[PDB]
Symmetry: C2
Subunit: 241 residues, 2 copies
């Protein structure tokens, strides 16, 4: 109610991470079939994720990323001033999620192999008078619907566990610092960063347009009113992860 909170991926792999985080949560929230439209969010999430698994090597990207995080925590092993029990517990969480990741099936394989899902995948993507089979499925017992949605979801558990952890640890590393965008513009650079997080006071009536090239990024604040650049000086907070 005071500040708009934005996140911006700084590279294509992080843009996939954030997109998958969003779909996993959407399918999870939609999987109670509590309202008679929630199935629409559920299936569209599932099918958007499958499309992603075809076009990127997500499992190996995420394995390597979790190895990078582990290494940053292992540098604090046996350091007097760091809680060794907390640290070891986190390192154990990492190799459990990474191990699960490594022995996992091809992402979206069990989804692609499900007869019912494929049979509707193409047409779902183009209400159910043109999908009689989906309409029949929506008419099954709520226990049955929930069971099937849970089976489909269990197949993404290695991905979900790994991504959830990576993101949690990545967000941890960001410290919010005060910045000013004089006349609506800010630029800076970051070595090896994946995510920008912005906190912007709502009073300004602005949203950020962010772009980047190599390690540099540029934030332009646009008035919501007209979609045009805001010339006012914008005080905001920025965490770079």
């Amino acid at each position: 109610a005071t500040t708009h909170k934005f996140e911006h991926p700084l590279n294509e792999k992080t843009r996939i991470y954030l997109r998958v985080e969003s779909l996993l949560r959407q399918a999870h929230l939609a999987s109670g079939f509590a309202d008679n439209h929630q199935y629409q969010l559920f299936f569209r999430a599932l099918f958007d994720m499958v499309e992603i698994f075809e076009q990127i090597q997500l499992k190996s990207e995420l394995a390597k990323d979790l190895e990078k995080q582990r290494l940053s925590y292992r540098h604090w092993l046996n350091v007097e001033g760091v809680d060794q029990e907390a640290l070891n517990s986190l390192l154990n969480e990492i190799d459990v999620v990474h191990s699960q990741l490594m022995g996992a099936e091809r992402f979206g394989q069990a989804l692609k192999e499900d007869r019912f899902l494929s049979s509707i995948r193409q047409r779902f993507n183009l209400c159910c008078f043109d999908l009689p089979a989906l309409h029949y499925w929506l008419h099954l017992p709520i226990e049955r619907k929930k069971h099937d949605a849970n089976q489909w979801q269990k197949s993404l558990k290695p991905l979900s566990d790994a991504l959830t952890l990576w993101l949690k640890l990545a967000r941890e590393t960001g410290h919010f610092k005060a910045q000013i965008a004089r006349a609506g513009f800010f630029q800076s650079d970051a070595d090896e960063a994946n995510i920008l997080r912005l906190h912007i006071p709502m009073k300004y009536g602005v949203y950020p347009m962010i772009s980047g090239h190599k390690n540099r990024f540029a934030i332009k604040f646009m008035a919501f009113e007209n979609g045009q650049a805001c010339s006012q000086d914008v005080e905001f907070e920025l965490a770079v992860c």
Copy 2:
């Protein structure tokens, strides 16, 4: 313990049924109660704009409402028919039909909305969260009151279409009567003269679903086993209403 299916017999009714569905979808997502309803709300709004941009929906709906109005005229001055209720139905058709003919181009106000048209084409691409669409993300963090007010203004622009379609579908469904039928070896065929919608009731017990196809005034219903997608070839009892 009955599976209820509706099939449009022509491309106009196809659109009618799509719009009915999108209208309810935007309406139920309108309260922004869950963090993900806004997805259903804006997808529906934009799917409607798409649908309009392709077909003479106002003209087809007006004529259909006029046809319904003709049908009631076998009820005026009939012994034991409540003329108060009848005159009210006739008036309601008239008001809804006047509103519809008087309406602005469908979807025009949505197209002319600065915020909507700024997110429309990015919105319509493969989609999952809002790091992509910061204007949308800003909008989602406006007070709930303001979001609902914006949502209700956008929906109100569709109100003449919604009233007309809701009324025509209500009256078309009420005049269809379910008659027991039989698809011996999983196949049924008949012919619908002037019909728009097939309404089927299939016992849950068969684990079948209907494939329906059409030619001129004829339609065919072939049942498929949901478990293996294969053609069912046994006697299927069901109720059929042609509307």
